[PDB]
Write a protein that binds this ligand. Structure first.
Ligand SMILES: [Zn+2]
Ligand SMILES: [Zn+2]
Lengths: 369, 366
């Protein structure tokens, strides 16, 4: 599997897919999958390309998720190997996206291809969910795919996000949780003395910024809140404003839900007698994948392939996992060393990419058979 | 009086002096006053023209103040007589600024002139302070004149502001006080488990207090000091919270008390901040005495009624002129039709205003 993985990784690295421009990465991938009888669906939105490709006719649905976009290179003259050459030196594959995450994307694709080729009538559904914008504004990427699937009640049961998870040695870390994000765009209307609506708003703001959402848990720090924006008045003096806008964001853990958060904020506003409107913008749900089928399939795949037991951690780097978690899928993340991601001279071990393909493949085996 | 006043009114109304555009109004006025021996001093600033005309040298310095600027007319369609014609229909003079306040400005100028003519060696100083921007920003208008004056230690003893004060009948109301005005521009700095010491939280406590604190509950002559928030804006950056607020304050507090109390509230929450205060006016209250008598008696003499002295209602540069420490009163025509289509004023009332302002001068100086 090494050479297949490496060859696909180089192919992708050679395509300079700075977000959100895919530069034909997904076209190469769809061409190899379609050839093997995967059903291909394109889900573009604005300037972002998204691919949803699947093989199978039943549950469980196992999605491999990743992105073809890469961050900018910076000064290409400060690279020892040109960033889109995909040079291999001393078993190290150099290039922007080598680690984050074209090498592990290639490994997930090759693993999926080999499993399907070997088992044309396999149980469940093996899917790839590939976006061209994880790294930038990312409003039109995985979130678009997930809203499309949800709109038509299509399910994903399990998801492996192939973001580079490993800290010091291949296999040493699997990510098994991420925080959610929700933004409140609050508009307080209508703005004797204690009845002033700016006073009632300030009463609200004081309760909001000292309310204890949770203490967190063993796996997450406590839910945090940011007041991102306060705006009343158009800039004219001696004119009382009609509206007071407050934008706040929570990065939240599994101790609370979007519904608890919405309800607490509604209660607080009612308690302080405020009239208002609010537009809520949910940017993903937290997840925490506990011991079970999904965590065990990837843990055992790593143990049996390279003889290391991963530690399960939450957070660190970024991923689209919280978007996928919006659908109720159970999510984990695994892939190669992340120390060089987003830096000059990004690289990845070619041997590790071969082992990653074996690992992804064995996870499919463990999760279906 | 009447003809003289209504002829000058008409002249002024026919210039469409939307603020800060004087449209030659003050040139007219300066011309006339020049002829009778008034020293003319122009004090333009930016796009605003201001006139400072004095006759005489010594105290008491008595100033008639008002403005040549006028608010916009709307579609000249809806006006039964053209806005800047100044036609007299059925004893009513129609025109934008007929009531606010070219009519009474005309009256004040005529009285000043007639008094100087008749008393060329009079004691004291008769002045006129006129701006082409009272109705808009007005940081370029009367305050600039006053600033200039204070700077040279020039003073005004008494001031009559010709804003239209009468409610139902000419002469029924004189304004003898206004509240002061001060704006604070506040920037709270460093706003970005142990949640209560977060700056945003502390800033919220401060905002709670600022928006409900009771500065005073007025007194016999004023309503209470009010605070209004004008702007609140915030949103790794030099993250500050900007709060702009205004106080309209009575004699129960001063600018220094306001400043000192806001500072205490901030310091109580250990807030890092900077603040710039802009004091535009002080309150004034002219109690019974020489000034208030002179205008009270002037109205009684001319009309046979006695005005009620009131504080507030409409607007004026009075609070701005109170900064000099001048005693200030305001009197003028019926206000009901100001800032509206078909603005007009009684030509009979205009003539009477002239007599009124003229008697007030006589009363004050003799
Ligand atoms: Zn990535
Ligand atoms: Zn006026």
């Amino acid at each position: 599997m090494k050479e297949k993985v490496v060859s696909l990784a180089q192919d992708l690295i050679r395509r300079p897919s700075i977000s959100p421009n895919d530069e034909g990465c997904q076209q190469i991938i769809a061409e190899r999958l379609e050839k093997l009888g995967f059903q291909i669906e394109w889900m573009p939105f604005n300037d972002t390309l998204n691919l949803w490709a699947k093989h199978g006719t039943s549950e469980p649905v196992i999605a491999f998720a990743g992105h073809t976009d890469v961050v900018p290179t910076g000064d290409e003259n400060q690279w020892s190997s040109p960033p889109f050459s995909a040079e291999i030196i001393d078993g190290m594959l150099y290039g922007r996206g080598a680690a984050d995450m074209k090498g592990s994307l290639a490994a997930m694709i090759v693993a999926a291809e080999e499993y399907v080729k070997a088992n044309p009538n396999h149980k469940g559904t093996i899917a790839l969910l590939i976006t061209s914008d994880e790294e930038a504004t990312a409003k039109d990427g995985t979130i678009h795919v997930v809203e499309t699937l949800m709109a038509r009640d299509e399910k994903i049961t399990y998801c492996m996000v192939g973001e580079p998870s490993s800290a010091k040695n291949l296999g040493d870390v699997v990510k098994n949780g991420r925080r959610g994000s929700i933004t409140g765009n609050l508009y307080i209307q209508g703005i004797h003395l204690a009845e002033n609506p700016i006073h009632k708003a300030a009463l609200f703001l004081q309760e909001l910024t000292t309310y204890q959402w949770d203490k967190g848990n063993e796996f997450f720090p406590p839910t945090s809140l940011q007041i991102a924006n306060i705006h009343a008045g158009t800039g004219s003096n001696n004119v009382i404003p009609a509206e007071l806008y407050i934008q706040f964001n929570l990065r939240y853990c599994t101790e609370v839900t979007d519904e608890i958060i919405k309800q607490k904020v509604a209660e607080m506003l009612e308690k302080h007698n405020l009239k208002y409107r609010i537009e809520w913008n949910l940017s993903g749900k937290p997840f925490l994948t506990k011991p079970g089928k999904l965590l065990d399939s990837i843990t055992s795949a790593i143990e049996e392939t390279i003889g290391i037991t991963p530690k399960a951690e939450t957070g660190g780097g970024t991923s689209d996992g919280r978007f996928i978690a919006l659908m109720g899928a159970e999510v984990v993340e695994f892939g190669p060393l992340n120390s060089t991601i987003h830096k000059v001279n990004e690289c990845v071990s070619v041997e590790d990419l071969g082992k990653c393909g074996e690992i992804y493949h064995k996870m499919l085996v463990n999760l279906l058979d």
